[PDB]
Amino acid sequence: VYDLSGFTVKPVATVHRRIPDLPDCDIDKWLNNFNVPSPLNWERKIFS
Amino acid sequence: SVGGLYEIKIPTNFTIVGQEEFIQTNSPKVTIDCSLFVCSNYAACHDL
Ligand SMILES: *[C@@H]1O[C@H](CO)[C@@H](O)[C@H](O)[C@H]1NC(C)=O
Numbered sequence: 001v002y003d004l005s006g007f008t009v010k011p012v013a014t015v016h017r018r019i020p021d022l023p024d025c026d027i028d029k030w031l032n033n034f035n036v037p038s039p040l041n042w043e044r045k046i047f048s
Numbered sequence: 049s050v051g052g053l054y055e056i057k058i059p060t061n062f063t064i065v066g067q068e069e070f071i072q073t074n075s076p077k078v079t080i081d082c083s084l085f086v087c088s089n090y091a092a093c094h095d096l
Contacts, residue, residue, distance in 0.1 A: 003079065005081060005084060007089075008084075008088070008089045
């Protein structure tokens with residue numbers, strides 16, 4: 001009687017999870033803002 | 049010995065006492081897959 005090393009079942013898929021740490025830029029939220037300025041008084045926002 | 053006789057305490061009444069003893073004649077048959085323990089299924093470890 002021989003104990004043969006049967007294969008380990010191969011994982012079929014990958015799952016990744018991780019907290020994004022940095023907050024979302026939310027560029028769309030500021031671009032979707034309905035109170036859009038005129039080119040004379042163009043608004044400026046810095047996404048850093 | 050007083051007059052050639054010795055003082056001895058001889059039982060006048062008895063019982064049977066039971067005493068259980070366990071003697072180990074066997075142990076779990078541990079089997080180790082040496083390659084799967086050491087390397088699991090990682091080819092670089094199996095090569096080393
Ligand atoms: C022996 O001891 C048992 C229990 O202690 C008792 O029931 C019995 O009568 C005794 N017999 C004699 C002859 O002492």
